[PDB]
Design an enzyme around this catalytic site. Sequence first.
Site, short mmCIF file in Angstrom:
data_model
loop_
_atom_site.label_atom_id
_atom_site.label_comp_id
_atom_site.label_asym_id
_atom_site.label_seq_id
_atom_site.Cartn_x
_atom_site.Cartn_y
_atom_site.Cartn_z
N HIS A 261 45.76 1.27 50.25
CA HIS A 261 47.00 0.57 49.96
C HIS A 261 47.40 -0.55 50.91
CE1 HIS A 261 48.33 3.44 46.79
NE2 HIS A 261 47.61 4.30 47.49
N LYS B 32 63.29 -4.64 49.26
CA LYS B 32 62.04 -3.98 49.62
C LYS B 32 62.21 -3.61 51.09
CE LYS B 32 59.43 -7.73 49.22
NZ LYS B 32 59.23 -7.57 47.75
N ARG B 33 61.31 -2.80 51.62
CA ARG B 33 61.41 -2.42 53.02
C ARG B 33 61.38 -3.65 53.94
NH1 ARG B 33 60.76 3.03 54.48
NH2 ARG B 33 61.03 2.20 56.60
N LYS C 217 56.66 -9.19 54.98
CA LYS C 217 57.41 -9.41 53.74
C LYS C 217 58.17 -10.72 53.86
CE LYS C 217 57.39 -4.95 52.12
NZ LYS C 217 56.84 -4.54 50.81
N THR D 209 55.07 -3.75 43.86
CA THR D 209 55.39 -3.16 42.56
C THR D 209 56.79 -3.61 42.20
OG1 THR D 209 56.06 -1.13 43.72
CG2 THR D 209 53.88 -1.16 42.69
N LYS E 67 58.77 -4.83 38.48
CA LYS E 67 60.05 -4.33 37.98
C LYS E 67 60.94 -5.51 37.59
CE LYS E 67 59.52 -0.56 41.23
NZ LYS E 67 60.11 -0.06 42.46
C1 CR6 Z 1 50.58 1.58 52.88
C2 CR6 Z 1 51.30 1.25 51.92
O1 CR6 Z 1 52.46 2.07 51.62
N1 CR6 Z 1 51.01 0.15 51.18
C3 CR6 Z 1 51.82 -0.30 50.03
C4 CR6 Z 1 53.31 -0.19 50.43
N2 CR6 Z 1 54.20 0.39 49.61
O2 CR6 Z 1 53.69 -0.67 51.57
O3 CR6 Z 1 51.43 0.41 48.76
C5 CR6 Z 1 52.10 -0.10 47.57
C6 CR6 Z 1 51.60 0.74 46.37
O4 CR6 Z 1 50.15 0.46 46.30
C7 CR6 Z 1 51.67 -1.59 47.40
O5 CR6 Z 1 52.29 -2.24 46.28
C8 CR6 Z 1 52.10 -2.36 48.64
O6 CR6 Z 1 51.66 -3.70 48.51
C9 CR6 Z 1 51.42 -1.73 49.86
O7 CR6 Z 1 51.85 -2.41 51.06
C1 PLP Z 2 59.70 -0.48 43.66
C2 PLP Z 2 60.30 -0.01 44.96
C3 PLP Z 2 59.72 -0.39 46.17
C4 PLP Z 2 58.44 -1.28 46.30
O1 PLP Z 2 58.92 -2.61 46.38
P1 PLP Z 2 57.97 -3.85 46.75
O2 PLP Z 2 58.81 -5.05 46.63
O3 PLP Z 2 56.65 -3.80 46.09
O4 PLP Z 2 57.80 -3.61 48.24
C5 PLP Z 2 60.29 -0.02 47.30
N1 PLP Z 2 61.42 0.71 47.29
C6 PLP Z 2 62.00 1.11 46.15
C7 PLP Z 2 63.26 1.91 46.24
C8 PLP Z 2 61.45 0.76 44.95
O5 PLP Z 2 62.09 1.10 43.77
#
Ligand code: CR6
Ligand code: PLP
EC number: 2.4.1.1
Lengths: 810, 810
Positions: free
Chosen positions: B351, B542-543, B548, B650, B654
Amino acid sequence: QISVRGLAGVENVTELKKNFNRHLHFTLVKDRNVATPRDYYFALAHTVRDHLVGRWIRTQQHYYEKDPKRIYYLSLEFYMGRTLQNTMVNLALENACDEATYQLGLDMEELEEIEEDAGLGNGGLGRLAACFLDSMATLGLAAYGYGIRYEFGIFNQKICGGWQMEEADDWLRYGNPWEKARPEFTLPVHFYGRVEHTSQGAKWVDTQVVLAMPYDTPVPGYRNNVVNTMRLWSAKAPNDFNLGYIQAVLDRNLAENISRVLYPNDNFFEGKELRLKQEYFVVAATLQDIIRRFKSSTNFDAFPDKVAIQLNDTHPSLAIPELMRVLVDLERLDWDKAWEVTVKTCAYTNHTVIPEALERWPVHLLETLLPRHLQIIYEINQRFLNRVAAAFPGDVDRLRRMSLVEEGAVKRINMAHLCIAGSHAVNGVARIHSEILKKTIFKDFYELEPHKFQNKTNGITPRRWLVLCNPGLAEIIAERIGEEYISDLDQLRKLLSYVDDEAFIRDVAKVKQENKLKFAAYLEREYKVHINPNSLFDVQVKRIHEYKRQLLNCLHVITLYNRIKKEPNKFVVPRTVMIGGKAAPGYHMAKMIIKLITAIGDVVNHDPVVGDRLRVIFLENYRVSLAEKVIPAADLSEQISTAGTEASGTGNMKFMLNGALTIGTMDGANVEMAEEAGEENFFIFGMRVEDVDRLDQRGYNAQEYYDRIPELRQIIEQLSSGFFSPKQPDLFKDIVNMLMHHDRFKVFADYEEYVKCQERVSALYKNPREWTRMVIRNIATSGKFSSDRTIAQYAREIWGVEPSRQRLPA
Amino acid sequence: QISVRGLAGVENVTELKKNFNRHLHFTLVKDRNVATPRDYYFALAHTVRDHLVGRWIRTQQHYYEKDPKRIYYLSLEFYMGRTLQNTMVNLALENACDEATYQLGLDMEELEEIEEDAGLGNGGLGRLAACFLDSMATLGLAAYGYGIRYEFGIFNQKICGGWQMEEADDWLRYGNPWEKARPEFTLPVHFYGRVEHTSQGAKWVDTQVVLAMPYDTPVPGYRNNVVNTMRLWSAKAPNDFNLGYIQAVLDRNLAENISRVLYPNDNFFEGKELRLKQEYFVVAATLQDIIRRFKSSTNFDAFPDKVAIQLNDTHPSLAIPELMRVLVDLERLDWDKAWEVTVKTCAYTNHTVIPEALERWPVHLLETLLPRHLQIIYEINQRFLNRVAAAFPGDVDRLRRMSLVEEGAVKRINMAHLCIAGSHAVNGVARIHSEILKKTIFKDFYELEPHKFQNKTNGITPRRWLVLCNPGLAEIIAERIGEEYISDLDQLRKLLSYVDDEAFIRDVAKVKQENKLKFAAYLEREYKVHINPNSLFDVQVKRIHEYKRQLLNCLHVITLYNRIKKEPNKFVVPRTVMIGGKAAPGYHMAKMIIKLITAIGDVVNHDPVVGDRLRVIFLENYRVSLAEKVIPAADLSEQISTAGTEASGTGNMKFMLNGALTIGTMDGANVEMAEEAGEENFFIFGMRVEDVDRLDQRGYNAQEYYDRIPELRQIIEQLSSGFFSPKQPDLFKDIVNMLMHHDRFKVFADYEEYVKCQERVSALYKNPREWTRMVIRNIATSGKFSSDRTIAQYAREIWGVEPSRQRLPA
Ligand SMILES: CC(=O)N[C@]1(C(N)=O)O[C@H](CO)[C@@H](O)[C@H](O)[C@H]1O
Ligand SMILES: *Cc1c(COP(=O)(O)O)cnc(C)c1O
Ligand SMILES: CC(=O)N[C@]1(C(N)=O)O[C@H](CO)[C@@H](O)[C@H](O)[C@H]1O
Ligand SMILES: *Cc1c(COP(=O)(O)O)cnc(C)c1O
């Protein structure tokens, strides 16, 4: 099916079955193909529970409408045991459920054995609270039991190599279907901090906050549709607690440890901080709940008319200064008005006179943990001593004797003195105990306020201790006098006119024989132990304590053994001596006594010459559920504490109600029991309280008995030489040394009369008919020892409320 | 009521109501007079839950009968969010429940807001696991999600003085109606100990035992009557644990701390022992469960035919050596046979490529905690390198690069290398990410076994991310193409023929406007914040991470502000810039970025000259439930990570599915999204991966950008001088210093093109009709990003199972 177990109606059995299946499906999420006995137990529990809610809701709604005076029973212990059968009994559902489960192809008795005991108590004091709740509900009192929901109750006892091993009582493992969490009523409890004195009042600031989450358990009265509440508090950390990050979250456990485990001490005080926290925790949360409910019924003058707080021993004694703190600091009442309210609201029950059990908290602990409460206690003490000084001018020693503050190595607060000063009533738990309180321990207090001192002899609930554990006996009794006695035990008197009834004598003896066979069987099933059902069942079950003198019982067992080896071909009444009970983990002597018992068994149970004439068994993990099994099967009840040490005893009453004859000293309630049944129908022996004092003025010298009693000498020499511990010859040196040089309970002093009395017991047992007739005389006069009588006296003479036996609507 | 929400039948609404009342009475033990909204929420939850059990039981019974290949998805995170509405959606109960509660005089939307989010995840990785479970159930796969039941999930974020404050997420406080404890399936997990080498095999002895108690949560497929299981393990101490007495009982918490809290790190590795324990805990318990189920279907040759284990990143990588340990040590299979089974059973999903997120455990930790596993890992490494050596003779550096064991300061185990060696398939989460894996990070591995490497572009579930959070949009879409798209998102393509449809354009725009009003309202209700619903909703949720680049967004906001102050009376498209996300507690820079955002808001939101033309809001406590609210209300989706850093993303999907246009870099899934909708319908800007590498070969010098871009210079000088922090002029020195001297993510390098691109966005927003037409083109081509497509590819290309859309019986 037996009559006392209710009707097995067509409609109800059908309804029970479908609800049983509904719960198995929707609640347990299981199908009959994968359901285990535990799943079946839970399906049944939820089915029975459903029948409680309706009544539970209207009972509480009822109290809201009629707004009667509320009784708050504060205790750090509620030894409830199992709830399933008790609930069925009080709801008259036992036969219906028995039938319904039968049709589902299940054995209800098998399912009941799956329920975990709610062991939130140590022994007598905790069980008393449980019986009281049952009686208060049965008498229609608006009562609430308030305590702590311990994650771990009294430890499960395991015997390894003859030694007691303790293991966590994880009773909540599989969930508790009887409790209802009420997170919405969470309350904050404060600890530590400091006291700030501003213009308009003192403030307790910079405190650490711990949340108290309540869990409610229903307490059904006997067939009166009343269902009271037992509210147990659980410790929860606030969410901004300690709020590197990971650690802060993990440290939440420090705050939640408050309700983690029950201190396993029976009649012994251990001044640990965690225990003090538990005591304030239950008190602080409960009082806020009480006041909240009161304000929703601001002149607190009516507080005592709507509220009664009963302190089960001194454990919740902080209720007195906490009530003052709230009324003075928060509600802003003047001291004198607040004090008046407090005294009229609180009542204290003393449960022992042994010095080591008396709570004396170090001032430095209260100083750090509850600074404001310490100030209030000093103020109370100050005003109290001013009253003493005015009543007994110049009596300086009385002042220091009555002070709530004890001077010395480390200053301590005598909680018992605190309770007497802040209560309008103080009671002992048996006539002799209450008298001892006025004549010794609290003499100065009785002289100052004689009106405060009362007696309230303990009792036991005839529902759990007769109908539930001994249906066979309840049935034959009901067959001759009806069922009204179950909630009016005095009616057992009527059985006196059946003492010469041949049919009755035969049934009473038959029930006992069946109970013995049933227990002798259980013994082999769950503990691979064979015993002779025809022998006299000699049992002593209660917590292991030196004052209980399990050791005196041991001396007798060894005496019987030596006599047999001396004259092998001589006839002797066969006996199965059963001793059971847990020892507090840090009580070394108590643990040595358990080892001695098993050691004696190792020798006696394997001596070919003895055969099936004598067997010594140690009943492992004695608890409420086990008591319900052994007591109905006993012939001889051992209540042999040194006169003046057992405040009352309740196990003694259980045995009397279930057809066992009693051998004991004139101690605690034994005195009243013998008085009720007649001394000729009791096996009384040993020193009376007066004889004990005489011996103490003279000076107790065990050696004297050792020198004048050959049989006693032989026993001590057997213990000393390793006869009972071959591989470890000096294993019992501590026991012998204590017996010989520092026996606070004069074991040797009652030996001769004990043994002699035991011979009289064996003689009577040889005459089945007369033994049973004496049994009938005991059962027939045990009515006074019902907790319904006890609670009725508390209600009328202390709480000022009238008991009622009126049935609430369905 | 809207069509996509199901029928509100007469019989069902009636049935729902009575069951609602039954639960309120019997389950919650409440009457309407004292019930609070929380009680109503629980009554509804239990009512809906009842509809799941029947299907849950037959689904599981079904798998037992047909015995298909089982998919085990191992993850330390399952970011589930709320369960009530999702369950109603998948069961077609939403309108019925809406009606039923309406008749009971309750607002169902109000009750849904009471449910606590199950925040057992950090972000993308955890949410992906949640979407996957939903899709696997919808595609009829016999899948099981296995993880840890954390007592505390991701912390709740509070903003104080503009700073992030963390507080425990006590999500289980009021109870979880969705889970079913299964204490009967408790399993032992071992830790520490040592390895003994006897004649016939090695033994792992003297270990510390921790019990794993499972809790099952139902996972309903979309209207197909399939209900799969998510099994979460909870740590429990054995009862003879530490078994002075009191302490032993309190120390049980040491063992139970394993499942106490979720590590709050997103894309960052923290080598803490507790984390390693959590990883082995979930792996050890899960594998025993897997094997148990397998043996109940001993030739393990068929194991890979009946079992597939998917490793969500390396977190559960110990499954590989644990599977070997069990097969070799316990089942006694020869190494080679065991290894064959293991490789054919396990598949690994990577990931991320950022070095700081890669798990490299210190050997000394594994040495102490899992001695046998370390030996197995060395053995695996040994045999693996022998294959490398034979494939690339003499290439000594390759050997050291591919070793699972990394030499240096402290030896470490590269878990990613372990996963590649022990898996038959390794996949990235987006085409560009997967390519980067083969070209860089895992190049050596791809060269050795090219067949193992695959791609599986991420996806999101259209149930929760469309139907559930945006019913208005799902409705107008259904009105024109039916409801089949909900489980076949590719059908949204059909919307392409409505791009010139005036009515549709009007409805799409109307739905967005309503969502914006609905959110603008919510903002004022729960957070007292007023915003202009007519402004463009520019959001980045996002986090918080440097990669980012929330900072790049900040630079733009400040640019907009400075331009307005420069020419106040000039027209500019109004915007509400919303940024939200949590920062890991120990990530200082991330916490400084949050402060910068709020600081910018403090200045911009109170400047009279700006008016309602620009607003900067920081969305507090961003989580799944909040995402469901903001995403449907967004116009502009910010996906601006430096090319090559966001594996997939992801959140981007959305936003695309919910009518927002995207401004972003050609990173992660953005590339495929733009490819699907057409680059003309996407706002792409900045460096491509190739441009980033070129810059790195040249050497990134931020000063150059500072010197050549006046507007950028002005911003840095404003930050440095304290313009955004008056009282603390140097508050943001760390930020400026990083930007200027050690910016690993080249924020300045994409500034100019970013700003420029943002101007193109504002220009299009001025033309409502054309903006909406582009939106339609995005929504219409978002079908590929459904997790149903993703899971179908995993099933066919990795697990070897065929998805099915057949409905199981009622
Ligand atoms: C390590 C890790 O959690 N990686 C991450 C994320 N949530 O940060 O996984 C998600 C699900 O594959 C990816 O969309 C993100 O780009 C990736 O950085
Ligand atoms: C979809 C989702 C994420 C992932 O967001 P990205 O912009 O791909 O980092 C993180 N947190 C929550 C609460 C989500 O619903
Ligand atoms: C302190 C304490 O628990 N005292 C005791 C007991 N259980 O040990 O209370 C019970 C209940 O009143 C009495 O019957 C016992 O004689 C007394 O010792
Ligand atoms: C009744 C009871 C007691 C009290 O017994 P005594 O002999 O009065 O000490 C203690 N433990 C249990 C389990 C009881 O049922």
